[PDB]
């Protein structure tokens, strides 16, 4: 078994984010880090849209990301520290649209290690030094310089090691062109390892250490070190030099401190709390991120707490000394991992989970009545504020993000033919269930259905410098109707066409000269009201034409090729030659004559002959055959297009062809994507050319910087369309349906899935599908959470206690505190308690989003497993079983017990009714229907259970599973068990002896997250550490059993090992496209979706193996990682080809593409076609 890995949807979770002038111009861009992907974004200051410019797979783990600029430069660099032992410096090249590696410096071994630097990265604010640091003793400093050609030079590292030391955070300090300084939060643990009493562990303080780099003497020295009051998280650089003092802000538990070396005293400010907070009073408050905004007049900071409250921090200063810290409540947004404040007044919020946000900073300065807290204010007792809806910010853009994906099911729950992806994702009150469909989403522009026989509609403007169109002309079978956009579009008279007979061609001939072609001829219309008409000789009638704003070719009966042209005079002149051939045309197309040239030469001619003929039309060799190529079937239309020149061949079936424009065909690609004739129409996507193919389903064909995409749309069949433009929306489509006249639009920048979302209450854990009604039964559960009833009674308690505060009892804030509940999706849920849980069972319709039934559980009960099944001793009734833990503590682990609930699932799968509740002595983590009964994993125990009248009846039990059952899967005869730390146990159920016997196990420890059965002998598994494996039983395996490694007697073999780089939580074998092949689809915690597909021949496997081998050397990973070593992170790779490395061939430069291709005995286009074939065989 040999597998090929493909990514269908990349990760969308953000870890780090930096901003700067990375292209060298005055506009600002953001560089975000996924887990293993680097990405450049640019928000538009005109519309507020965030566009993705570049995204690269780095094949490593990015751990720290900084931006810096040399003095006198206008371009920002990128410093990356990763899980390799290298520091890398990158530069964005706007003209090539790629990241160019400038420097690489190796300092240690690879991997996320304790003492090898790469976790912390600081840079001097003037850009002359950079510090890379590990969590332990090792720190390195590089000096950055510049030569006379203005290129960046790097020096050899300087060591600043210090044994038995832990680092919390490092930042560079802003000095005024003095010696560079670095600040560190450090802790010494030497004394704590020598005291058995445990008192040296306590009484141990953090220190704030300052490291000075002396560029004159070329060494790093410890200058200052001071013990702190309590332990603090990250540090903040205060802008110094000539704009501001030069110190640090220490963020801590419940406090924020300013500190500077010299004669400056320490200044502390306590963090304000929300008035009438519902969270556990024992919990403290920390800041989670920060954002600095420097202006040539002043500066301030933006810090956010764990509740999602952003405060605005300013600093009250003297000539050199700081006197006060002032805090003011700014706004409430979701908890972010990073915040970027952009010039032109934009705030970018990258959340830890879920969608990301871009805000417009609407209110500058602060003219408000809300109180401003200070460090000078005396308090014995803490500050209090009231959270409110957004006042300083306005929401401008929202970027979708599937992180974190927790459960997935691929199924056809609607009655389409293509399956949809049902994804339980999100955490807390921002969780949701999302339905993903392969296609694009058609935006509604306009609808007005008119009775008649619509056939075609053009959108032609009156001028060529016009951005406003002139008319739209929909032809009936008896007549036509031509309208204009007066913003109240209806009948129009002064157009000039007024066709009694239908209109089969409407073109902008001149600047304001229009060509109207109709079955009885052509009447050229002026800007003024004048018409020159050429009608039919006798009974020959045109059906097809080929227009262009310099030349117009027509087709009468018999293939009489008649070509016109309009020379700089601006009127008609027809050519002398009329070449006629055997049959009448069915298809032709004239390429849009570019402003560079005078006219178009190529004209593909498809006839009843079933052959494309290519013909010239320039005055030198106009209208004489050049090359003919037969067809597989009846063509309907073709079109020469770009985005370099291609043409497309539409058959009368739901299948397509393609041929690159040249005197000879050079490329070939056919996609079985219908039973209905393909209609090829002109449109404009991304402001450039694209072809809208139409069948029973309508597809959009567009390459994208060598990214060919044939993507369907989320609507049914149409019959004619073209581009659209108006004051309403200057870029769209005018599409026609049966008994309909529509205008549509497509506004999604190159995505593969469109999604709809339905909100939930808590973190979803697992859902099942009812087989009859196709309803979903979901369980949601959260830790540190209140139930609804506990929240209500806690709030009533707080009210009755605040009304008896022993004070005139004359003004009641309690009645105002009880009325309106602030929404938890915006302000967060009150996280209160350490062993407190909250769980819910929900019945949901997947077509709509409505909740059919909802069962709330008691306070400290936590659901972990769910199943829907039928019992043999009962009839055809359905039951729902829910496994629940009781008083679970996670660290140290402790649980009071467990329960199994049983419901009857009545009213056509819409209602749950309680039947009974069976106690168990441990957490039931897995429930699986099995042969008219049910298997339950109760902690370490595997049990069989039958349905009873008052509880569930234990029938069989095995007690030899190692640690903890996390999953159970059954194929008809056997049972597969997943252990939390051991990988897989095979069990057989003896039907007549009533015995569960272990007959096989594995030889590796695996932290299994999920498992999938591939056949009767093979299992696909996933891991907490990001690995996928396939395990198969040897053919010797004996099933009829009644240890050799302290285990089972027979072992299983590992036939596949792969490191993905992200934690997989869903595995499923399925077929994605209609008429395709089966693949293994997996899902990741960062929001990524991927497949593993098998090879069917040795030749494909060998070719792709050689491609991977040659691309491993000549196109190495960007951040210094070894590709083979990265995919062998925990186990060596076995029988997997990385198709994400292989598809990077299409993005190399032509010279290296030729060097790679000429070793495989092939050209780059053939390699590209071979790469596309295997992808389109399985996925999209």
């Amino acid at each position: 078994m040999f597998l090929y890995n493909l990514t269908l949807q990349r990760a969308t979770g953000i870890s780090f984010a930096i901003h700067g002038n990375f292209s060298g111009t005055k506009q600002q861009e953001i560089v975000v880090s996924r887990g293993k992907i680097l990405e450049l974004l640019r928000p538009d200051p005109n519309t507020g849209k965030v566009h993705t410019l570049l995204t690269v797979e780095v094949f490593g783990v990015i751990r720290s990301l900084m931006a810096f600029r040399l003095t006198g430069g206008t371009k920002d660099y990128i410093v990356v520290g990763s899980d390799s032992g290298r520091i890398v410096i990158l530069e964005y090249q706007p003209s090539k649209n790629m990241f160019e590696k400038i420097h690489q410096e190796t300092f240690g071994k690879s991997g996320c290690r304790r003492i090898v630097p790469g976790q912390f990265l600081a840079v001097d604010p003037k850009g002359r030094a950079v510090m890379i640091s590990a969590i332990e003793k090792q720190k390195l400093v590089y000096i950055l310089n510049r030569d006379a050609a203005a290129r960046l030079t790097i020096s050899s590292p300087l060591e600043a090691h210090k044994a038995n030391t832990l680092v919390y955070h490092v930042v560079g300090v802003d000095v005024g062109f003095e010696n560079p300084m670095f600040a560190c939060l450090e802790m010494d643990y030497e004394e704590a390892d020598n005291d058995p009493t445990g008192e040296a562990a306590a009484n141990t303080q953090q220190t704030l250490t300052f490291y000075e780099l002396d560029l004159g003497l070329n060494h790093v020295v410890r200058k200052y070190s001071e013990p702190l009051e309590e332990h603090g998280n990250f540090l903040i650089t205060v802008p110094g030099g000539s704009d501001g003092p030069s110190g640090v802000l220490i963020c801590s538990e419940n406090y924020i401190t300013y500190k500077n070396f010299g004669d400056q005293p320490d200044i502390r400010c306590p963090i304000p709390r929300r008035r009438n907070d519902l969270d556990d009073p024992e919990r403290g408050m920390i800041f989670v991120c920060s954002a600095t905004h420097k202006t040539k007049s002043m500066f301030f900071f933006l810090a956010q707490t764990e509740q999602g409250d952003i405060f605005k921090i300013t600093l009250e200063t003297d000539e050199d000394m700081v006197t006060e810290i002032r805090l003011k409540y700014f706004d409430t947004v979701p908890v972010a991992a990073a915040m970027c404040v952009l010039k032109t007044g934009f705030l970018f919020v990258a959340s830890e989970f879920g969608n990301h946000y871009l805000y417009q900073i609407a209110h500058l300065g602060d003219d408000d009545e809300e109180p401003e807290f200070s460090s000078a204010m005396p308090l014995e007792d803490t500050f209090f504020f009231q959270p409110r809806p957004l006042k300083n910010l306005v929401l401008v853009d929202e970027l979708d993000s599937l992180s974190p994906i927790l459960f997935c099911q691929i199924a056809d729950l609607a009655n389409e033919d293509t399956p949809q992806l049902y994804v339980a994702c999100g955490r807390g009150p921002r969780s949701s269930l999302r339905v993903l469909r392969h296609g694009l989403e058609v935006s509604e522009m306009a609808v007005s259905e008119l009775p008649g026989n619509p056939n075609a509609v053009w959108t032609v403007r009156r001028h060529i410098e016009d951005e406003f169109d002139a008319y739209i002309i929909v032809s009936f079978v008896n007549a036509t109707l031509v309208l204009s956009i007066g913003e109240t579009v209806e009948e129009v008279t002064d157009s000039g066409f007024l066709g009694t007979t239908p209109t089969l061609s409407c073109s902008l001939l001149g600047d304001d000269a229009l060509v109207q072609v109709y079955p009885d001829g052509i009447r050229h219309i002026r800007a003024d009201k004048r018409v020159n008409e050429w009608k039919t000789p006798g009974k020959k009638t045109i059906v097809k034409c080929a227009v262009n704003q310099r030349q117009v070719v027509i087709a009468l009966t018999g293939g009489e090729l008649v070509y016109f042209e309009m020379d700089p005079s601006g009127q008609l002149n027809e050519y002398t030659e009329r070449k006629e051939m055997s049959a009448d045309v069915v298809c032709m197309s004239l390429a849009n004559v570019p402003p560079g040239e005078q006219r178009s030469r190529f004209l593909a001619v498809g006839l009843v002959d079933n052959t494309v003929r290519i013909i010239s039309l320039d005055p030198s060799d106009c209208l004489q055959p050049l090359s003919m190529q037969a067809l597989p079937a009846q063509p309907e239309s073709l079109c020469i297009v770009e985005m370099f020149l291609y043409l497309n061949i539409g058959l009368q079936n739901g299948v397509l062809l393609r041929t690159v424009l040249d005197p000879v065909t050079g490329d070939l690609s056919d996609t079985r994507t219908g039973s209905r004739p393909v209609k090829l129409f002109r449109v404009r996507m991304q402001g450039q050319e694209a072809v809208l193919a139409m069948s029973s389903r309508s597809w959009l064909s567009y390459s994208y910087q060598s990214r060919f995409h044939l993507t369907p749309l989320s609507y049914e069949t149409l019959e004619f369309a073209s581009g659209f433009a108006s004051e309403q929306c200057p870029e769209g489509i005018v599409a026609i349906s049966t008994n309909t006249l529509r205008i549509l639009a497509l506004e999604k920048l190159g995505a593969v899935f469109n999604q709809v979302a339905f909100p939930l209450q808590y973190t979803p854990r697992k859902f099942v599908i009812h087989p009859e009604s196709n309803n979903l039964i979901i369980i949601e559960t959260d830790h540190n959470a209140y139930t609804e009833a506990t929240k209500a009674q806690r709030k009533q308690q707080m009210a009755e206690e605040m009304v008896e505060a022993a004070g005139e009892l004359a003004a009641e804030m309690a009645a105002a505190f009880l009325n309106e509940n602030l929404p938890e999706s915006i302000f967060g849920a009150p996280k209160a308690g350490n062993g407190q849980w909250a769980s819910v069972i929900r019945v949901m319709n997947p077509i709509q989003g409505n909740t059919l039934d909802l069962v709330q559980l008691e306070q400290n009960e936590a659901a972990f497993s769910v199943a829907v099944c039928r019992f043999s001793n009962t009839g055809e009734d359905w039951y729902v079983l829910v496994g629940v833990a009781k008083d679970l503590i996670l660290n140290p682990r402790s649980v009071a017990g467990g329960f199994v609930y049983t419901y009857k699932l009545v009213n056509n799968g819409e209602k749950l009714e309680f039947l009974h509740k069976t106690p168990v002595e441990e957490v039931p983590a897995a429930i699986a229907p099995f042969q008219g009964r049910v298997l339950i994993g109760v902690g370490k125990l595997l049990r069989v259970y039958d349905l009873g009248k008052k509880k569930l009846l234990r029938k069989c039990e095995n007690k030899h599973i190692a640690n903890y059952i996390s999953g159970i899967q059954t194929i008809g005869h056997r049972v597969i068990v997943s252990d939390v730390q051991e990988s897989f146990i095979w069990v057989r159920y003896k039907r007549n002896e009533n015995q569960l016997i272990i007959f096989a196990d594995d030889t590796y420890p695996r932290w299994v997250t999920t498992a999938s059965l591939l056949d009767y002998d093979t299992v696909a598994g996933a891991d907490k550490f990001g690995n996928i494996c396939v395990v198969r039983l040897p053919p010797n395996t004996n099933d009829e059993v009644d240890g050799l490694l302290n285990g089972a007697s027979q072992k299983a073999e590992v036939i596949m090992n792969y490191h993905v780089g992200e934690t997989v939580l869903s595995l499923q074998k399925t077929t994605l496209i209609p008429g395709g092949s089966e693949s293994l689809v997996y899902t990741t915690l960062s929001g990524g979706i991927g497949i593993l597909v098998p090879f069917t021949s040795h030749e494909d496997h060998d070719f792709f193996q050689h491609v991977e081998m040659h691309l491993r050397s000549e196109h190495p990973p960007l951040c210094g990682r070894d590709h083979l070593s990265f995919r062998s992170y925990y186990f060596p790779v076995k029988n997997v080809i990385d198709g994400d490395l292989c598809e990077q061939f299409n993005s190399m430069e032509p010279n290296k593409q030729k060097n790679v291709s000429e070793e495989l005995d092939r050209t780059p286009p053939e390699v590209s076609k071979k790469l596309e074939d295997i992808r389109t065989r399985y996925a999209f």
Binding site: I154, S156, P157
Partner: protein, 85 residues
């Protein structure tokens, strides 16, 4: 007294003499040179500027690690200059 230096390596490139030209510094193999050798600053200074890392004669070409030593990440230790005490 054949001991490696094992100090933090810098930007200086290691050199080999006419007798050691094809050799790997760590395992003394001659097959598949893969990674350019870096040496520390005290090994590259003054009279020590250009010298064989194996023996110490006048350098003529670049020193390399072999593919076998690169696979095992033996190029990630300190300066590989042979120093005698």
């Amino acid at each position: 007294d054949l001991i490696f230096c094992r100090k933090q390596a810098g930007v200086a490139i290691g050199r080999l003499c006419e007798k050691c030209d094809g050799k790997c510094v760590i395992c003394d193999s001659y097959v598949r040179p893969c990674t350019l050798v870096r040496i520390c600053d005290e090994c590259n200074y003054g009279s020590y500027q250009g010298r064989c890392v194996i023996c110490g004669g006048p350098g003529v070409s670049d020193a390399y690690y072999c593919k076998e030593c690169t696979i095992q990440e033996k190029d990630r230790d300190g300066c590989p200059k042979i120093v005698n005490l």
